[PDB]
Amino acid sequence: GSSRVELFKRQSSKVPFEKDGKVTERVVHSFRLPALVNVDGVMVAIADARYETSFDNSLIDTVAKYSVDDGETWETQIAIKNSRASSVSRVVDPTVIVKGNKLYVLVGSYNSSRSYWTSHGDARDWDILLAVGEVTKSTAGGKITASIKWGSPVSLKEFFPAEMEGMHTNQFLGGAGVAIVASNGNLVYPVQVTNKKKQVFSKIFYSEDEGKTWKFGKGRSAFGCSEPVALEWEGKLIINTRVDYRRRLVYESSDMGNTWLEAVGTLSRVWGPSPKSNQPGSQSSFTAVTIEGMRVMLFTHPLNFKGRWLRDRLNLWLTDNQRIYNVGQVSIGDENSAYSSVLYKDDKLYCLHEINSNEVYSLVFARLVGELRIIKSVLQSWKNWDSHLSSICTPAGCGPAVTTVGLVGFLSHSATKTEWEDAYRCVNASTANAERVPNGLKFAGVGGGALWPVSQQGQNQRYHFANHAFTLVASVTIHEVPKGASPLLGASLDSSGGKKLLGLSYDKRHQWQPIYGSTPVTPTGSWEMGKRYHVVLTMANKIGSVYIDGEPLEGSGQTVVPDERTPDISHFYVGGYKRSGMPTDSRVTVNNVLLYNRQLNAEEIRTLFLSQDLIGTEAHM
């Protein structure tokens, strides 16, 4: 269904180049840095127009295209022009906010420097400009048209302090793409800033007065975070950052960037910049939108299988801040496709992104028909499994409802010869020696069990939250007394399962063996063969607990990770290690595995234990 047109056409599309009072249509080398938004039904595409070469330090104006026929035709204009002082004069990384009929565009402007802004030792070639574009629509003679009056840029330099906590400032740019209007009316731009030590960091730069004046939040990301892109979610700014050669860092701020906290329990470090997460990162589109009644976030980044800056394979992601789903590749085949901008308008999905051959960049305008289709299906799957659980009439008359808050994965009835199927469709677990049973799998034999990947997910690690906090729940039944300690459930630190963050085993004397990190295991309680047991493992604040049938076990509530270090879980193991190299034999049935991104409370745990017979997806198929 999806279709595209080369909309900003390299070495071809012309723009009105204005110098010293004179305007001429001028062909442009390369187009980059797409920003695609909506203003009262008017579609607006803003970007770099790189006249002579794709090189960063060269002649660049900020181009605008606009369409009132959902992008079948466009008008073309230059939104902002550089100073024309020299052949490297340039306005850069145009960052857009829409509020009412106004386009607020923020750009760096450089007169003559022949080096990348980040390499600079002073602020002698730099200024930070804001220009406002006023969109007007007309209905003359029954023809819907639009026009945009671009005001003169204004310097916001007076608003950049010489100092921030522990440093002296140098320069700052917007993070590019599209920024936002906060619910309180504030213009909010995430910004990339340099200090005299040449560190790059990201901040929140905001206006409470329609851009008259600006202020910076006192807080900041870690050093090395550039081109931040932001959105607002349940009252907080979520600042999504690029870190060259490292996983992307994601932050949350509830007070206009005054205080920043890494989004460890949701989105930070999920997205790698390449298969080995050892290459340059990218600009990313990141918006919060509503689709079929559901508030969600869309996020794009290229997979960069090729490496360096080529950045092939622009991929789109969908999240409700709990589950994270891979929509798929937006770009075509293995073309280089780095920067992008996703717009949801009148229930249609679009993307303006780069394609680059031989360092010559064009921007394509794609109708993401196939992608939105996949999105709605996944979203209806989410709403409906949350509804299922939610509608359950818990035992003690109706009890407290089963929590879906923070629930990320659900392994139940649906299964396959070699995979166990996630109800929320994001991450399946692989299985071995498993026979299907109502709402679960029956496992047996050395090498049996199911593995639910964490770090093993690869480049994009959606369960990364597990290192900071989680609750893994399951119903289990043991079918033979073991010859020795054998596994049922757990979070493994290494490939085997031999090193465990937190886990439950069972032994030859019919006692439970909970494993807390590397602490010596002390057996406890009692279990009978053939009895269905409820198991819950929680982990939070470096403390681990293990519950059976709703009550904690012996020693529950122990430290499982040293103060200093952050864990790096490899996978969860269910009903065995799923490893041929591991000598144990778990003859067990696991049903309804649940995974939450927080430690459930007493009550939630009791509820789940009481409703084990009801959550299973067998009929609700």
**To what resolution in angstroms was this structure determined?**
2.2
Same domain assignment for residues 452 and 549: yes
Give me the sign of the Cα torsion angle 67, 72, 75, 80.
Answer: positive
The number of distinct structural domains making up the chain is 2
Same domain assignment for residues 432 and 381: yes
What are phi and psi for residue 564, nearest 5 degrees? -25, -75
Same domain assignment for residues 551 and 488: yes
Same domain assignment for residues 440 and 573: yes
Burial 438-475 (b: 16+ CB within 10 A, else e): ebbbbbbebbbbbbbbbbebebbbbbbbbbbbbbbbbb
CA distance 228 to 252: 12
CATH number where 447 lies: 2.60.120.200
Give me the sign of the Cα torsion angle 489, 494, 498, 502.
Answer: negative
Same domain assignment for residues 410 and 324: no
Fill in the amino acid letter for 91: V
3-state secondary structure of 472: strand
Burial 111-125 (b: 16+ CB within 10 A, else e): bebeeebeebeebeb
CA distance 229 to 95: 10
CA distance 340 to 195: 28
DSSP β-bridge partners for residue 130 = 106, 154
Same domain assignment for residues 586 and 564: yes
Same domain assignment for residues 425 and 504: yes
CATH number where 10 lies: 2.120.10.10
Q: Which of 367, 384, 419 is the last residue of a domain?
A: 367
Neighbour-count burial of 181, counting CB atoms closer than 10 A to its CB (0-12 exposed, 13-18 middle, 19+ buried): middle
Q: Which of 304, 336, 367 is the last residue of a domain?
A: 367
Q: Which of 367, 384, 403 is the last residue of a domain?
A: 367
CA distance 591 to 575: 10
What are phi and psi for residue 244, nearest 5 degrees? -60, 135
- Domain that residue 515 falls in: 368-621
DSSP 8-state code for residue 91 = E
Same domain assignment for residues 475 and 588: yes
Same domain assignment for residues 17 and 94: yes
Same domain assignment for residues 372 and 305: no
Fill in the amino acid letter for 371: E
Residue 16 CB contacts under 8 Å (≥ 6 apart), including other chains: 23, 24, 25, 26, 76, 77, 78
Same domain assignment for residues 372 and 329: no
Q: How was this structure determined?
A: X-ray
Same domain assignment for residues 350 and 374: no
